[PDB]
Design a protein around this ligand. Structure first.
Ligand SMILES: N[C@H]1[C@@H](OP(=O)(O)O)O[C@H](CO[C@@H]2O[C@H](CO[C@]3(C(=O)O)C[C@@H](O[C@]4(C(=O)O)C[C@@H](O)[C@@H](O)[C@@H]([C@H](O)CO[C@]5(C(=O)O)C[C@@H](O)[C@@H](O)[C@@H]([C@H](O)CO)O5)O4)[C@@H](O)[C@@H]([C@H](O)CO)O3)[C@@H](OP(=O)(O)O)[C@H](O)[C@H]2N)[C@@H](O)[C@@H]1O
Ligand SMILES: *[C@@H]1O[C@H](CO[C@@H]2O[C@@H](C)[C@@H](O)[C@@H](O)[C@@H]2O)[C@@H](O[C@@H]2O[C@H](CO)[C@@H](O)[C@H](O)[C@H]2NC(C)=O)[C@H](O)[C@H]1NC(C)=O
Lengths: 219, 218
């Protein structure tokens, strides 16, 4: 099989700058009909891949002039000029010259932007959930940059690790930020044993952690 | 424009088979080939096979023993079937027009998320997340929806029947006690809610469930 190797794995780029992405094939990829079926795809967050470049260097109808493909033999390159926020996602090369057709591993284009602190919100268990016997406490940490962040839960001042489930969004195409959800799940009975619930975020934008809290008895 | 609409089951029992129909509009199956591709977090994008306009099929040698592609040109349908599915076949499967020479019909369908599991279909419980009754007020208020205890993926979350689309974060689901949970947040002006209603709508196609939960102040 033809092995397609992409580099880099991850590529941060400022708005307006040029991104360059490499794809190498383990052997030549000239179809018997003479065409070199090297294609470049972009997969935006939440979407299917979309064709950008076909037959090495041809822009697919409708694709902006900023995207250009080149190369020959076993060495291929995609260049994205004047990068826009909407260009983020995962770029893949593909060869369709020798069966089985194969894809590269992908290159994730990340947009650089100014640091932004998370907007932190905490939510006690809903009355509906408590009625069913459960108690999830939810914390959102939204629209921050850079992506690195830590969340800590405290119950009556003591750090709680067990029962926390975290989830992270891809980079946002509108504002180039990241978001995170952290959910502390307890039984109703455990939940009702304690009073103070705290979500603490540590991010490079603040010296001190960002704290949101509530007291179950003040509900 | 081209559409490649897919139908078929999301949930397949281990060792059983996966059948997907791809209904093509916008070009003739008598003139263009259709490819099948899958995507997983572990193996990335894998090309599975192709059916050329005249009916010739080519398959990835890794799957040829258990993969079948066929079509009906007059109905504009392409049929994918794979046998003997195991847990490492969990993926999103796509019907695709790719590897183009001259045509304008390149298109990649929305795909069919296929989960290979003996676990049972279960609808979600949906809980509204309003700020705490003693929570302070800001110029923008964040609300949410907790979607808990469902199987399999996916769910679709919307806000105000899809009219409230900006300022939304719907987080990836996490699998715990053999069931998925996710949350969705939406941020709106404090001068809007609660005077203006905010409702999360959750659809879980596998259980045929559609639930609306109004976010009510506590
Ligand atoms: N010089 C060419 C010429 O020679 P002859 O006219 O003297 O035969 O044509 C040869 C092909 O003969 C015709 O073959 C079709 C049947 O073709 C297929 C099938 O459709 O089932 C497919 C064949 O596979 C190839 C091929 O060997 O030519 C290689 C594939 O990699 C692929 O490249 C396909 C097609 O060309 C792909 O077509 C598309 C596409 O889907 O992307 C669509 C087209 O509209 C067009 O856009 C083309 C592009 O131009 C790229 O080529 O892309 O071709 C092969 O598997 C044969 C199989 O051997 C059984 O024949 O099946 C016959 O059609 P039917 O009447 O419907 O049976 C036709 O009668 C033949 N004349 C070519 O090989 C020579 O190089
Ligand atoms: C994908 O998985 C199959 C199935 O593997 C078996 O079943 C799985 C659910 C899991 O329980 C594994 O531990 C099992 O081995 C792999 O096929 C098996 O491969 C081994 C050789 O490596 C062989 O001894 C088994 O007989 C194979 N079984 C079948 C039904 O083919 C398969 O290799 C995996 N594919 C890849 C690309 O890794």
């Amino acid at each position: 099989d033809v092995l397609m190797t992409q580099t880099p794995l991850s590529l941060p780029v400022s708005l307006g700058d040029q991104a360059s992405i490499s794809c190498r094939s383990s052997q030549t990829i000239v179809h018997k009909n003479g065409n070199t079926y090297l294609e470049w795809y972009l997969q935006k967050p939440g979407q299917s891949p979309k064709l950008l470049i076909y037959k090495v260097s041809n822009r697919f109808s409708g694709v902006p002039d900023r995207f250009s493909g080149s190369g020959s033999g076993t060495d291929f390159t995609l260049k994205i000029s004047r990068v826009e926020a909407a260009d983020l996602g995962v770029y893949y090369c593909f060869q369709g010259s020798h069966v089985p057709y194969t894809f590269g591993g992908g290159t994730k284009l990340e947009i650089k932007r100014a640091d932004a602190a998370p907007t932190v919100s905490i939510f006690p268990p809903s009355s509906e959930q408590l009625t069913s016997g459960g108690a999830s406490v939810v914390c959102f940490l939204n629209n921050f940059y850079p992506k690195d962040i830590n969340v800590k839960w405290k119950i009556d001042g003591s750090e709680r690790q067990n029962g926390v489930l975290n989830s992270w969004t891809d980079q946002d195409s509108k504002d180039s930020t990241y978001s995170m959800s952290s959910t502390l799940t307890l039984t109703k009975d455990e939940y009702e044993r304690h009073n103070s619930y705290t979500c603490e975020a540590t991010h490079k934008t603040s010296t001190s952690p960002i704290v949101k809290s509530f007291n179950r008895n003040e509900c | 424009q081209v559409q490649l609409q897919e139908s078929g089951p999301g949930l397949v029992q281990p060792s059983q088979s996966l059948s997907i129909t791809c209904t093509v509009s916008g070009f003739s199956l008598t003139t263009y080939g259709v490819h099948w591709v899958r995507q997983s977090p572990g193996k990335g994008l894998e090309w599975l096979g192709v059916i050329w306009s005249g009916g010739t099929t080519e398959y990835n040698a890794a799957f040829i023993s258990r993969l079948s592609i066929s079509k009906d040109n007059s109905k504009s349908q392409v049929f994918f079937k794979m046998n003997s599915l195991q847990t490492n076949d969990t993926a999103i499967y796509f019907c695709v027009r790719m590897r183009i020479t001259t045509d304008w019909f390149a298109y990649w369908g929305q795909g069919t998320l296929v989960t290979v599991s003996a676990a049972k279909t279960t609808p979600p419980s949906v809980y509204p997340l309003a700020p705490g009754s003693a929570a302070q007020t800001n110029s923008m208020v964040t609300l949410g929806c907790l979607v808990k205890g469902y199987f399999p993926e996916p769910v679709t979350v919307t806000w105000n029947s899809g009219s409230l689309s900006s300022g939304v974060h719907t987080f990836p689901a996490v699998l715990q006690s053999d069931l998925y949970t996710l949350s969705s947040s939406v941020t709106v002006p404090s001068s809007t809610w609660p005077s203006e209603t905010v409702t999360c709508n959750v659809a879980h196609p596998a259980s045929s469930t559609k639930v609306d939960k109004k976010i009510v102040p506590r």
